[PDB]
């Protein structure tokens, strides 16, 4: 906005069966 | 840790380590640490912050 | 193995081995309570019943 | 008395395996979210994290 | 006029060796103990620290 | 971390008209 | 006469006395 900071192509995700981080790309 | 000693030799027997996480460590003083597993420890003469 | 500074008084080393302490409890009927307690890398009942 | 009673029992005791949402019976999950604003079943069921 | 006095106690065992069975009820029921053959049905090594 | 994944069902709040009510096991 | 480590019953207690499941 007033000073730049717009970035990020990210959301984050954790597959089910617990929270199990990394899906390793789909 | 003995008095004025520079190393602590720690050895653990053969054990499964399935679902082991890290370790943590800190140093205490013997007189400031009470012995749990006793109803009374008659040699505990401390009462500051344990 | 650990190397520590000299102390002029006796000291202890507190080593914590981080595990899972599962405390798990079930009631199957009124006034009945049951439990099973299990830990993984260090556990009790691992050389006796 | 060792490893052949750790590994199958991870799922049972919720160190590994499915989380509370897929573990609990569906009626209890519908209850748990209907009352949560005033009486909470949260923090009583373990979610595994792998 | 008898001075104030505090009780002391001791025991003595001479010609005895202390015995701790390897049973879960501590009784003799046969020379091969019931935990001795429980350790044949659960073949695993362990350390003993006394 | 030090151990804390001991959390709720990962539900969301129940749907309503007029912000709140109770539906129980429905 | 009798002494220790010789007090042998051999036989168990219960599952010989017939039981069958629900």
From TrEMBL, chains A, F:
<comment type="similarity">
    <text>Belongs to the adenoviridae protein VI family.</text>
</comment>
<feature type="propeptide">
    <location>
        <begin position="1"/>
        <end position="26"/>
    </location>
</feature>
<comment type="function">
    <text>Endosome lysis protein: Structural component of the virion that provides increased stability to the particle shell through its interaction with the core-capsid bridging protein and the hexon-linking protein VIII. Fibers shedding during virus entry into host cell allows the endosome lysis protein to be exposed as a membrane-lytic peptide. Exhibits pH-independent membrane fragmentation activity and probably mediates viral rapid escape from host endosome via organellar membrane lysis.</text>
</comment>
<protein>
    <recommendedName>
        <fullName>Pre-protein VI</fullName>
    </recommendedName>
</protein>
<comment type="function">
    <text>Protease cofactor: Cofactor that activates the viral protease. Binds to viral protease in a 1:1 ratio.</text>
</comment>
Automatic annotation (TrEMBL), chain B:
<comment type="subunit">
    <text>Homotrimer. Interacts with the capsid vertex protein; this interaction binds the peripentonal hexons to the neighboring penton base. Interacts with the hexon-linking protein; this interaction tethers the hexons surrounding the penton to those situated in the central plate of the facet. Interacts with the hexon-interlacing protein; this interaction lashes the hexons together. Interacts with host dyneins DYNC1LI1 and DYNC1I2; this interaction might be involved in intracellular microtubule-dependent transport of incoming viral capsid.</text>
</comment>
<comment type="function">
    <text>Major capsid protein that self-associates to form 240 hexon trimers, each in the shape of a hexagon, building most of the pseudo T=25 capsid. Assembled into trimeric units with the help of the chaperone shutoff protein. Transported by pre-protein VI to the nucleus where it associates with other structural proteins to form an empty capsid. Might be involved, through its interaction with host dyneins, in the intracellular microtubule-dependent transport of incoming viral capsid to the nucleus.</text>
</comment>
<comment type="similarity">
    <text>Belongs to the adenoviridae hexon protein family.</text>
</comment>
<protein>
    <recommendedName>
        <fullName>Hexon protein</fullName>
    </recommendedName>
</protein>
From TrEMBL, chain G:
<protein>
    <recommendedName>
        <fullName>Pre-protein VI</fullName>
    </recommendedName>
</protein>
<comment type="function">
    <text>Protease cofactor: Cofactor that activates the viral protease. Binds to viral protease in a 1:1 ratio.</text>
</comment>
<comment type="similarity">
    <text>Belongs to the adenoviridae protein VI family.</text>
</comment>
<feature type="propeptide">
    <location>
        <begin position="1"/>
        <end position="22"/>
    </location>
</feature>
<comment type="function">
    <text>Endosome lysis protein: Structural component of the virion that provides increased stability to the particle shell through its interaction with the core-capsid bridging protein and the hexon-linking protein VIII. Fibers shedding during virus entry into host cell allows the endosome lysis protein to be exposed as a membrane-lytic peptide. Exhibits pH-independent membrane fragmentation activity and probably mediates viral rapid escape from host endosome via organellar membrane lysis.</text>
</comment>
């Amino acid at each position: 906005d007033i000073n730049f900071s717009s970035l990020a192509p990210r959301h984050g995700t954790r597959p089910f069966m617990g929270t199990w981080s990394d899906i390793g790309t789909s | 840790i003995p008095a004025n000693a520079t190393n602590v030799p720690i050895s653990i027997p053969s054990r499964n380590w399935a679902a082991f996480r890290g370790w943590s460590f800190t140093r205490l003083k013997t007189k400031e640490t009470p012995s749990l597993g006793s109803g009374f420890d008659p040699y505990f003469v401390y009462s500051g912050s344990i | 193995n650990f190397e520590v500074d000299p102390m002029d008084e006796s000291t202890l080393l507190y080593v914590v081995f981080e595990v899972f302490d599962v405390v798990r409890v079930h009631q199957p009927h009124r006034g009945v309570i049951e439990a099973v307690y299990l830990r993984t890398p260090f556990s009790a009942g691992n050389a006796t019943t | 008395m060792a490893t052949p009673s750790m590994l199958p029992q991870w799922a049972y005791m919720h160190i590994a395996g499915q989380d509370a949402s897929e573990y609990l019976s569906p009626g209890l999950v519908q209850f748990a979210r209907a009352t949560d604003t005033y009486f909470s079943l949260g923090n009583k069921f373990r979610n595994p994290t792998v | 006029s008898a001075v104030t006095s505090v009780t002391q106690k001791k025991f003595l065992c001479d010609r005895v060796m202390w015995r701790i069975p390897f049973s879960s009820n501590f009784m003799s029921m046969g020379a091969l103990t019931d935990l001795g053959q429980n350790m044949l049905y659960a073949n695993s090594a362990h350390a003993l620290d006394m």
